[PDB]
């Protein structure tokens, strides 16, 4: 049928991997040809800023960072079956984008 691409994005690696594993297990149970989770390079957003609110003291800096992890899953399935598979409980913090 149609080729379905599921893009998962998260800041939490453990929850992202749990959701990906559950989706792949569901696809296997439905007996679908599923390409494994392709792992995009992790994005590291960085903000480096002075610690002090004023301009006084030793010039110390805070290095804040956020990590964004991305996964791709490919399926060959009908759209209804894909929606049913994606209808399973999704952990908070995981953003799912389905494309046909």
């Amino acid at each position: 049928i149609h080729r379905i691409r599921i893009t998962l994005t998260s800041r939490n690696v453990k929850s992202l991997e749990k959701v990906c594993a559950d989706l792949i297990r569901g696809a296997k149970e439905k007996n679908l040809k599923v390409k494994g989770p392709v792992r995009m390079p992790t994005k590291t957003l960085r903000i480096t800023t002075r610690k002090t609110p004023c301009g006084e003291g030793s010039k110390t800096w805070d290095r804040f960072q956020m990590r964004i992890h991305k996964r791709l899953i490919d399926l060959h399935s009908p759209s209804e079956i894909v929606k049913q598979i994606t209808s399973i409980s999704i952990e908070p913090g995981v953003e799912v984008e389905v494309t046909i």
Partner: protein, 75 residues
């Protein structure tokens, strides 16, 4: 269309502003935090949920209305 970096930063900023607003609005009611689960469900954790709900849900309806108006959610 918006990039993933901007999207995640924007979601964080929305949560930060929502938590600040609820902290100022519900401080006396035992407000402790907020969980946003995407309809978009917003869960307010409080020690005294009766005061959060108000008289027959009037206060919670007001909170929903102001949140929707400020953040541009569809009605």
């Amino acid at each position: 269309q918006i990039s993933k970096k901007r999207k995640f930063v924007a979601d964080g900023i929305f949560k930060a502003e929502l938590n600040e607003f609820l902290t100022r609005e519900l401080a006396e009611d035992g407000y402790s935090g907020v969980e946003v689960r995407v309809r978009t469900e917003i869960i307010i954790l409080a020690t005294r949920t009766q005061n959060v709900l108000g008289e027959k849900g009037r206060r919670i309806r007001e909170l929903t209305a102001v949140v929707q108006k400020r953040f541009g959610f569809p009605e």
